[model samples]
Target chain A: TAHINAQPTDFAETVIMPGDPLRAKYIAETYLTDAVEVTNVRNMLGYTGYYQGQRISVMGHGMGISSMVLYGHELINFFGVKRIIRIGSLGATQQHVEMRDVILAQAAGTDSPTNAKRSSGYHMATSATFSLLHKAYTKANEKGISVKVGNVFSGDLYYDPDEDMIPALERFGVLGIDMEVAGLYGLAHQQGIESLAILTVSDHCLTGEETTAQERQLSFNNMIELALETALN
Target chain B: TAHINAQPTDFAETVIMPGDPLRAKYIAETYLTDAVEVTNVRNMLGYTGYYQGQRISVMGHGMGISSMVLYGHELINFFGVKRIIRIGSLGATQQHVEMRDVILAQAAGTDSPTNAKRSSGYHMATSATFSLLHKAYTKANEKGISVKVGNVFSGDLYYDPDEDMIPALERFGVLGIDMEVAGLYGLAHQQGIESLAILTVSDHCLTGEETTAQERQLSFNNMIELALETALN
Candidate 1:
């Protein structure tokens, strides 16, 4: 909360997080009723308000595990926030996971050592909150949205130097990749809080299909709605 | 040595590296009787030279695993470099490791995925060339410098959010911490070359005894002499 510069009461018990600060602002402006900007420290924004008569907040966690781990630790430890629903986007590792598709991280496998010590091994994973995942999945089907819940690779490298490794991971059934999803879950478990990740397929990395910049912002409405519905529940 | 910008013949089969370009320069000038600056592209600095009538090269691999992996790959792949000796400084994790002591990373464990795919299962990125260790240890024994040969935790985060984790790692027998040593071992194995890290204890993190500037420079000289002796053999 200090990092986000939010007061103790500013953030609700539940929150929705995005990687971009503008996305946080947009989500607050567009989704919540009477939303107020509670923090903007380091230009990483935070807002709190009512979502469908249920109190919730929206915040930006920046772009990586190194960045998100700080906020995740502080939010749960310092702010006493109990639930975190991360609504971000990912690069799909599979051809079937196309642009605009939703991928719920049932569990994560990382090309990162960040979770090793926390999870007690080199092979470590942090699961999304099972109820939140269930809720989001149920709602997605009701709305006829394309959703694939599977394993995702939490990688620190944006442009990985080892090219062979990525394709190898894709073959091991990693649906997509993000820098921070596993960290969010790991910190949540370490601190005894709850968290989940709902990511939109903004780039089909394995197939080399990417959406335009404008399309990235707009293509994830169904996914965001899934996150919002799940968070409030 | 394309990354080093050195011709195949410009490099020896073995190389010693420090994180700083100037340190590499100092190692070459101070130890090698017939040293020549072979490359200085991007001021990374490389030198071809003789150490005790044996051909050798000293170069700076720069900081962090990501930076070192590029050079490690190119050095082995391009120049047919068979052996690499990484020399650097570390913060001591154990009470037995004091300032100016030596920490030889027999195996390195890192909180970086730079080696995740390269290593297997819960073992992750660990283990080094034992014969490489045997040679360095024998040389250090002959030199009578205080040495610790065991595990070191390689972390990308110098300032970690979870402060208690390092202490936990120390409890698990992590003798010290560095930025890139495990990547050194992992990359070595992945490339099918031999490598090891011979580091100086410049700081004791557990008690927070940091070395002064003069002490750091003096301590490194001893470490460099140790590296050159073992590398040449």
Candidate 2:
């Protein structure tokens, strides 16, 4: 009831979601076979199509924890979905992981309310389903692409200018910063679903290294390829 | 400059802030020497009065992280206030702490976007200034009131229920749960101001024991007295 309307084709057991609506479109257009748009609720476009003879759905969940929780809750509860792979961009907090590199979030330390609500009084740490994450890592490695896998901090604000805390999180093993993943994991745990997040380092918070607009578009394709390939097998 | 039109006396240096506006009114009427309304911006009433011959201000911050941060930011940066004491209610997750007992937050853990923004990628642990907290503890002991001081989890969404996380937080040393302290601490650290929080256990999350409406009205007075006495010296 919290999410938008869906059709028979709108639901898939394995789902891939991105924060950007356009990225969902790109994934559908380039990878899926005979992909068709399923739901356009709130412009969060969802698509249904076949990947290597297996049907899968990809959708866009806008930004931040609130909306992500709403969509994740609905997807898990309403759509009969089991697995969700979140593909998005992240800002690297560590120096070793540079721009355009992929980081698979093993665990997410968040300043989000979703996990705290779930855990009650404990500090919320959203973790990926280790099996799915390991599978994605193995797939990415088979392609000869190195991945930085570790903890990432899921943040709420996009334009936060606080620069001092980056070194501290890096010291504590946070590899990158992104939105959405913590909320996704929290909802997944509550609803007993599987979730994983695959991120491309779009920018580096430490060195100020960043991908050009053109490079970002290119990286998006690569991310889609990796996500689709991971989902296919 | 994000918060505009704030005056010197718009708030008190040592302010008492509650999450509910009606609670703010109740506090002013119940405890304060000749309290007068100061600012009513957004219906979050602010008052200036004398507490133990010390000029203090009491205000309402409404609920959630965003509104709390705005008020905390404005009070410190615009109004030139130094010490802020948030007097609010929380749900006790621990078995030792019962309903209506006062809690002094030594450190706050939040699932809020505010700390992530302020700390960048760090797992920000917002804490109370030890000197002020120690003083308050001493006062609480002299009064023979049993108070629990430890970590608390601050959250963004109050209505989103998390059924399992409370036991997890209690395991991690979190004694109670509330909404505003994490943002208040994060903003205070950024601006180099001192702040503390004195929370009254309005209800027990595990036992579901709650104070009656009449008892709830008077429960906050204990925290109010402790905060005022802590500030006066």
lDDT of 2 at B135: 91
The TM-score between candidate 2 and the true structure equals 0.53
Residue A87, candidate 2: how far off, in angstroms? Answer: 0.6
Report the C-alpha lDDT of model 2 over B1-233, residue by residue, as the tens digit: 32223467556678778866556777777788888877754345678788778788888765556556766777876788898888887889888887767899998987665776677557766799999999999999998766889888886654467556678777877888887888788877877888899998866887897567777655666787788888775
lDDT of 1 by residue, A31-130 (tens): 8899999987645678998988988888987656756776777777667799998887787888777787788889886655667756555555589888
Docking quality category of candidate 1 according to DockQ thresholds: incorrect
- Candidate 2 runs further than 4 Å off: A212-214, B1-159, B162-233
Which candidate gets the maximum lDDT versus the true structure?
Answer: 1
Two-chain complex of model 2, DockQ on C-alpha atoms against the true structure: 0.10
The lDDT of each candidate is: 0.78, 0.76
Per-residue C-alpha lDDT of model 2 across residues A14-117, encoded as one tens digit per residue = 88998755667778888888888887653467888998898999987765665566677777767788988999878788878867678888988776656876
Task: Candidate 1: list runs displaced more than 4 Å.
Answer: A121-124, A210-218, B1-110, B113-233
